[PDB]
Design a protein around this ligand. Structure first.
Ligand SMILES: Nc1nc2c(ncn2[C@@H]2O[C@H](COP(=O)(O)OP(=O)(O)NP(=O)(O)O)[C@@H](O)[C@H]2O)c(=O)[nH]1
Ligand SMILES: Nc1nc2c(ncn2[C@@H]2O[C@H](COP(=O)(O)OP(=O)(O)NP(=O)(O)O)[C@@H](O)[C@H]2O)c(=O)[nH]1
Ligand SMILES: [Cl-]
Ligand SMILES: [Cl-]
Ligand SMILES: [Mg+2]
Ligand SMILES: [Mg+2]
Ligand code: NA
Lengths: 361, 359
C-alpha cells in the first residue's frame, strides 16, 4: 500500500546487537484477541557498528540514531529499542549513559514515539528468537506434533530455545510460558554471554590449529590448521569454563528437538563462497569437514589471494570448528542432524517476536 | 627539569596505544658514551580513552583522535613511536592496515612530528618493554644483578610475564630475547596471553553469581552470590583448561626462580582501592583473594555501591581478586604467600620507557 500504516497497525523494533543495529518497521492486523496477524516488514535498515561501541555523548548518539532512523519512509509510529549482548557486556552505570542520551534524543524530536529503550536479557532475546522463527515457519497457528528448536548464533552471545514442559527444578529465568493464538507454549531458554563469535574468537587468536597454514598469528607464530584440533580447544571454553554440556544436554535428552533452525552469523558462514550447502541446511559433520579442507589445510597467502572479497575468510577454520564445538560438544546435537539456516538475504533476526510479545522478564 | 627541556636535551615521543586508551609520553634524556639514553625523564604525558582499535578508521575519526592525543603537547618537532598492543592484535592485519594507512597519512599532512614507526607490536615485544621499563625505574640495569626480577603487566586485553632465563634451544625463539644494555648481556623469557587481559577475560564470567557481590544484578537476571574461591576455580579453567598457562609457564619458572616480582597495569588500580588493606605497595595472592572474598564477594551490592559511589570498577572486584589469583597462583605457579610489588597507581607506569632504551 501507498501508506501502509494508515490501514494497519505499525510499530518499529530496533535490534541493537553487538555488531550493528537493525531497524524494522512492521505492519500488521490483529485477530479477535488483539494478537498480531499478517505481519509484513515494510522497511528495514541495518547500520554498523554496534550501539554499545560508540562513545555515549550527544553528538555521537545523534549521528548514530539519525543514520538508523532519518531516511525511513514511515514515521509517526511507536519505537521499541532493545539492545542485546553488546550492551550486556557493560555494567548498569555505563549503560545508563547511553540510555540517558538516547532518551534525550527521542524527547528532542517528534517523528518517532519511543515506547521502550532498554537492554533485554538473553532469556528474553531467546524467547523472541523462537517466536520470530516459528512465526516465519507458520508453526504458531496450530498445535505442532514436531518440536522446533532455535539457535541464534550472535557476535557476543548465543541463544538456544526449545519446547520443555514447566519444571520446578529449573530456574524460572530459563523457562517461559506464553499463550499465543489460543495455544499454551512452554519453552526452555538460555543465552551464553561471551560465547558469541566475536567474544569467543578473542580466546583463540594464537591457536595455530584454528587458522590456515602460515596465517600470521598476532604472537608471531604460524597457523597450522586442523579443524578437529581447533574444535577440541573451543570445546574446553564451552564445557570446562561455561559448562554448556552439563546445562543443556540432559534437557535435550528429555525434550528432543525434531527440527533445528538457526539464525545469526552461521547463515553468513554457510552461504559464503568457501562453503557449499543445499536447501539452506547443513550438518555439523559437513560444516567441520568443509572448514578443515577448504580453509584449515590451505596455505593462507594463496587462499587469501584467491578470495580477496571476503573480509571474514581468515576466521572460517575457527568458526566452523567453533560451531561444531558449540552444537555437537556443547548442546549434544548429532553431527549428522540437519540444521536449517535462514538465508542471510532475509536479514531475519528476533524482532518479529517483539511484535507478537510486548512483555519482558 | 629545565624550562623547555627539549630545547636542551634529546626528546622522543612514545605512544602506548593500548586496548583501553592511548598514552602519549614525551621523554627527555641525555646519552652516555655509546649514545645510550640515561637520565630519562617524562616531560609530558597525555592519556585519552577509548582505545585506538575501538574507533572507526576513516580520515575524520583518525584526525579527531590524533588531534585529541597530540595537539596540546608542548613540543611537536621530535621523533614519534606509535606502538599499539593487544586491542589492535584482536584484529586481522587487513583491518589493522586501514588504521595505519590513515595514521600514516595524517602524519604526512603535518610538518612537526617526525613519525618513525607506527605499528602493532607483538605481546613478546611488549613484554620486553615491560621488563625494561620497570627495571629502569628500580635502577637495576646499570650493573649485573644479585637477583632475578620478574615483571607482570596486567593489561585490559593481554597479560605479559617476563623474567631472566638463559637461552634454551628447546623453547620458541619468539619467547626469548637477548639484549645488551649499559654494557651488560641480559637473556629473558617473554610471553603474552591474548584474551587474558582483565576486560577480555571478564566477558566470559559476567553471568557467574560466584564472581559478584551478593544481590548484584547479573545481565541474565540472576543475582550475585559471591564466593571468591568458587569464582577463582572458574577463572582457573580459562587459564589452564583453555590457554594452558600453567603447562607453558610453571616448568620454566620452577627452574628459573624469580626473587622479586613487580607488576604494572590493573593490579595497581585494584590494590589501591580503600576496600583493601595492603602496606608498602605490595600484596600477596592469598591476602588479595581473602580480602576480595570478605570485603566484596560476601557483602551486599547495594551497601558497597553506596559506600564507594565514585568507583566504576567496584562491581568487578570479587571477579578481579579471583582472576589475579587464578592467573598468578594457578596459572604461573607463584606461591600465594609470595610478595608481589605493584607500582603505585598514581605513577601510571607503562612500558614506554622501554622503547627509549631499546629502539
Ligand atoms: N561470514 C560473514 N560473517 C558475517 C557477515 N556479516 C556479519 N557477520 C558476522 O556474523 C556474526 C553474527 O552476527 P549477528 O548475528 O548480526 O550478531 P549481533 O546480533 O550483532 N550480536 P548479538 O546478537 O550477540 O548482540 C557476527 O560475529 C558478525 O561478526 C558476512 O558478510 N560474512
Ligand atoms: N580495578 C580497576 N581497573 C581499572 C581502573 N581503571 C582502569 N582499569 C582497568 O585496568 C586494566 C588495565 O588497564 P591498562 O593497563 O591501562 O590496559 P591497556 O594498556 O589499555 N590494555 P593492553 O595492555 O591489554 O593493550 C583494564 O582492564 C582497565 O579497564 C580502576 O580504577 N580500577
Ligand atoms: Cl600476541
Ligand atoms: Cl544474559
Ligand atoms: Mg543478535
Ligand atoms: Mg597496556
Ligand atoms: Na572478549
Amino acid at each position: 500500500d501507498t501508506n501502509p500504516c494508515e490501514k494497519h497497525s505499525c510499530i518499529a523494533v530496533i535490534d541493537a546487537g553487538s555488531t550493528g543495529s537493525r531497524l524494522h518497521i512492521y505492519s500488521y492486523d490483529t485477530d479477535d484477541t488483539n494478537t498480531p496477524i499478517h505481519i509484513e516488514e515494510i522497511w528495514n535498515k541495518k547500520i554498523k557498528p554496534g550501539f554499545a561501541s560508540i562513545q555515549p555523548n550527544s553528538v555521537t548518539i545523534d549521528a548514530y540514531l539519525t543514520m538508523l532512523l532519518a531516511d525511513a519512509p514511515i514515521h509517526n509510529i511507536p519505537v521499541y529499542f532493545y539492545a542485546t549482548a553488546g550492551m550486556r557486556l557493560l555494567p548498569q552505570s555505563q549503560q545508563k549513559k547511553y540510555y540517558d542520551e538516547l532518551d534525550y534524543w527521542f524527547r528532542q524530536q517528534s517523528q518517532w514515539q519511543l515506547v521502550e529503550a532498554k537492554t533485554i536479557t538473553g532469556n528474553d532475546e531467546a524467547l523472541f528468537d523462537w517466536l520470530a522463527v516459528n512465526y516465519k515457519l507458520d508453526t504458531l497457528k496450530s498445535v505442532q506434533n514436531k518440536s522446533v528448536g532455535v539457535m541464534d548464533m550472535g557476535g557476543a552471545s548465543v541463544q538456544i530455545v526449545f519446547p520443555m514442559p514447566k519444571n520446578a527444578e529449573i530456574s524460572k529465568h530459563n523457562q517461559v510460558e506464553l499463550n499465543i493464538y489460543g495455544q499454551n507454549i512452554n519453552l526452555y531458554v538460555h543465552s551464553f554471554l561471551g560465547l558469541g563469535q566475536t567474544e569467543m574468537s578473542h580466546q583463540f587468536l594464537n591457536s595455530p590449529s584454528c587458522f590456515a597454514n602460515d596465517y600470521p598469528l598476532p604472537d608471531g607464530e604460524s597457523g597450522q590448521g586442523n579443524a578437529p584440533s581447533c574444535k577440541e580447544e573451543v570445546t574446553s571454553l564451552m564445557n570446562s569454563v561455561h559448562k554448556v554440556n552439563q546445562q543443556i544436554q540432559p534437557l535435550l535428552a528429555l525434550n528432543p528437538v525434531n527440527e533445528w533452525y538457526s539464525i545469526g552469523g552461521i547463515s553468513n558462514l554457510a552461504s559464503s563462497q568457501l562453503f557449499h550447502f543445499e536447501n539452506s541446511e547443513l550438518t555439523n559433520q559437513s560444516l567441520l569437514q568443509q572448514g578443515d579442507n577448504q580453509i584449515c589445510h590451505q596455505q593462507w597467502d594463496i587462499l587469501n589471494g584467491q578470495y580477496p572479497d571476503d573480509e571474514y575468510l581468515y576466521q572460517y577454520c575457527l568458526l566452523s570448528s567453533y560451531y561444531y564445538a558449540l552444537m555437537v560438544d556443547g548442546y549434544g546435537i548429532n553431527p549428522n542432524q540437519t540444521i536449517h539456516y535462514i538465508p542471510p538475504e532475509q536479514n531475519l533476526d528476533w524482532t518479529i517476536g517483539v511484535v507478537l510479545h510486548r512483555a519482558l522478564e
